[PDB]
Amino acid sequence: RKTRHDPPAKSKAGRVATPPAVDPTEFFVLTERYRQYRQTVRALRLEFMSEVRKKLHEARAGVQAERKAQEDAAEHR
Amino acid sequence: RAYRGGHLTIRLALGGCTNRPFYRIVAAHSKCPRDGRFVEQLGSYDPLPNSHGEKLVALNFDRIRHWIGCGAHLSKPVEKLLGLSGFYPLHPMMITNAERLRRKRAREVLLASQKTD
Amino acid sequence: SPYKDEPWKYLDSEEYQNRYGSRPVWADYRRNHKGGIPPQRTRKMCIRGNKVAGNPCPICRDQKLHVDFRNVKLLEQFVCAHTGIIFHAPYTGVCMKQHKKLTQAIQKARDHGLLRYHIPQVEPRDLDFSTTHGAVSSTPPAPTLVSGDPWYPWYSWKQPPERELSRLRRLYQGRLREESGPPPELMPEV
Amino acid sequence: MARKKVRPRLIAELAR
Amino acid sequence: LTRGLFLGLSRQETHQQLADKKSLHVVEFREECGPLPIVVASPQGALRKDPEPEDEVPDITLDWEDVKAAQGMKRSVWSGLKRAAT
Amino acid sequence: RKPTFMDEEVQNILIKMTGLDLQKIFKPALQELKPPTYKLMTQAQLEEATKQAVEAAKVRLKMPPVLEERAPINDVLAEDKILEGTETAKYVFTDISYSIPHRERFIVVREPSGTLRKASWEERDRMIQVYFPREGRRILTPVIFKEENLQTMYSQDQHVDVLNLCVAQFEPDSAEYIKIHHHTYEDIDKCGKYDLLRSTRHFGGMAWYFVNKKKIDGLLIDQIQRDLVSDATSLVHLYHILHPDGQSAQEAKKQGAEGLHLIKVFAKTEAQKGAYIELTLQAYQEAFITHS
Amino acid sequence: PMKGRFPIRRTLQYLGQGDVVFKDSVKVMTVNYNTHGELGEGARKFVFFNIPQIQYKNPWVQITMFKNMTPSPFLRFYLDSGEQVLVDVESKSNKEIVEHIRKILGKNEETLEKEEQEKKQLSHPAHFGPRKYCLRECMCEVEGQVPCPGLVPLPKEMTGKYKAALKAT
RNA sequence: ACAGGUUUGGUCCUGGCCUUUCUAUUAAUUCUUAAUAAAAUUACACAUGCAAGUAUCCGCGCCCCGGUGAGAAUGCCCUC
């Protein structure tokens, strides 16, 4: 792949882009599906985010963690 | 390797020999190569049907939602693969391709019948 | 040779007893090599076309012997009685092509029960045999499943309002493409 | 990471 | 080599002789037979009721070649070669 | 309160029913042989070594669990008619995780018709093996379990190996496991090869099968001919527990006898062919008196 | 090994059969013993036999020897929180010291077995890759799946060379 | 290493070289077809074409992938 400092090609120096044709009925329906699809995934993403917080919090200062900490301390004494 | 930036992504890593593809569901940094170093391997995806006519897919569901929970992006094919399993809703592009197939097939049926008559 | 009907007939025949006797076939065969250490790989094949290549291997020197899964006495001579492992090619001296035939035949024979081999005792796969969990038991149907409605409202095709279509045509004027109606419900077969 | 043969490069800082 | 081999083999000690000079049973633990204590020889005559003194660290002379092979350090290109029949 | 295979009463009866033969249970197998290890032991230490083998034998004699036929799985999680002809094959998704037991894993198949349905037992077990392999399990059904191949092993009195192969390959509650075990139990009954599975851990399975099929005539004759009487009456005692509402069990409450007369109770009450049982028991009695 | 008084103690098995695992809080172990007197028999034999076993299982724990500085042999342990554990041995034998140490600061049997149990899940059997880290290397090593084209050649209908020819024709 | 050849008129001992085994490159002689893997003189000088665009302007990306083993006893593991 090219780098930042190399010069570009000569033949493909005039064109910029050529967007394809747009179907009016199809595009609007597809846009509607994406808007609902992104919203649904975002809620799932936030739901998974809260699950990670719950799992991490229980591993740090969970009830079983205090039981383990007190048991070893009591055994050591 | 030390990269400037990049985002954690779950993608498919190609494998196997020629004419026999085999994708591994893996989670790696976006700026690393396709077959480069990865964090954790999740599952596998066999693209070719076996003697039973089945395309086996493996998913590490509890670990998959762990990486998504911490902010891991998903590529186009993994979302379609997860959409089929039912872990995620059907991708909008999956449905549109289905609808396009029906219309093309309907045109093919009509075109053949018109020539027949 | 008139022995394809029953390959094991030759083993029970008097001709085999007269020549080889109690000892295995490969007992009297010695392989000529370059020195003290024999090469780790024997001849690939000694029956090339219609020409016998020098001193034949124990199997390719008498064509009446057939390598099949039916006969076990012949295949037993190539399997250790105590260790229960298949002898490698240098141990016997057979050519590599027949060695591959022996391995496949022995493996096939063990799959048909014609030859004995070790079967270790295996514990049951699962610790608790419970079918109560919902992974194996049927789950209650979804409210959208019994009704027949799609799982999500946007899965189906809905006709957009005409006002939105006019807006899109104005925005994408010049590069507009022909529109289409609702997709067919069922696709016929060609 | 470091070694005992580190050379104090200065041109890189000068260019920056 | 010939004299050394016969001298060593003629000096071999059997299980029965070992049992007689120790007045204790000798038990063979076959690896493929599991923990089954197979008895191969019994001391004829009086049987000693005193068990052998158990030493925590035995004092035996080991050969460096035997230990090297046991630990998996002999990687020669001649030890594991496939040879002809016996 | 119907009797079950895991009850202590049936287990204790079957533990002493199969006996304990150290020579047969510890048989030198066809594996990579290694040189033996020798050590010196006294008379007291020999008994300690012997009892350790007995404890190991008991653990090695853990009878495999026996259950009934599992119910088929027919569940549809969702239906999608938009994907009727999008793909030709069917996708199988397996949840893999070292912490989740295999009985709780989700195996879901996407049929080409667009229906999200759970995987059947036949394919669920195959998928588990592929991603969680273990020794002795073939992904596809081996040819050895065909009817033609079983007769070849049965002609070679390979009944013990067939049972050990079946438990390793198939799931104990599966349909194939049941029919193979029943076929093996039926064949040994016809040929009277009960001596093969004396010290085998699979002896509990055939004894339980016989006590539920009311076929004890063949087994009782062999035990008497082996001069094993103290355990023979236990099998009759097991029959009464499994079938209390019967004429034979009623006679035991009526007569209230003990010893060999318990067999005589069953011989003249529910035994299909009691002539052989009574004559053999008579043959045992006269022989035992002569020996004593 | 030929040289040495007890060559058996310099093999991998002897170094690996000693089961004394210190807790994560133990850093320094100091052992003082005398080279004369019958009372120091337990201490000297402990140094001569068990110390290599202890160090092998605790590579990160410093072990230092001091001879003929204190008339009464003893062991001193330094914890991470600055706590000092003093163990007095004047008549205890070789075996007694190891059992005494294993209880005051050694790890429990349940802790060791659960530690390695959690380590097993790292090498998950369901993964694919190199033999050193995963069991299988490719999906073709699974019975039923399409085999590798190197071993069994693939049918012509599936070869990409045939697929491209018909598309261009 | 299961070892073998070779000192001497001759034996024993000590002690080198070499044979027998496997992998890679080049060359010689020879050569029918298919599949898969791999493709390697040179950190020497380079003709020509191509390898970074996308996008309603802003912006984002532009040795990241890829390439090489020159340099440095560089390093491996590990703490932060």
Ligand code: FES
């Ligand atoms: S190694 Fe699996 S396809 Fe070749």
Ligand SMILES: [K+]
């Ligand atoms: K020499």
Ligand SMILES: [Mg+2]
């Ligand atoms: Mg460049």
Ligand SMILES: [Mg+2]
């Ligand atoms: Mg490739």
Ligand SMILES: [Mg+2]
């Ligand atoms: Mg750093």
Ligand SMILES: [Mg+2]
């Ligand atoms: Mg000389």
Ligand SMILES: [Mg+2]
């Ligand atoms: Mg000379």
Ligand SMILES: [Mg+2]
């Ligand atoms: Mg060349």
Ligand SMILES: [Mg+2]
């Ligand atoms: Mg080619």
Ligand SMILES: [Mg+2]
């Ligand atoms: Mg590179």
Ligand SMILES: [Mg+2]
């Ligand atoms: Mg170079």
Ligand SMILES: [Mg+2]
């Ligand atoms: Mg260099």
Ligand SMILES: [Mg+2]
């Ligand atoms: Mg330098």
Ligand SMILES: [Zn+2]
């Ligand atoms: Zn041949």
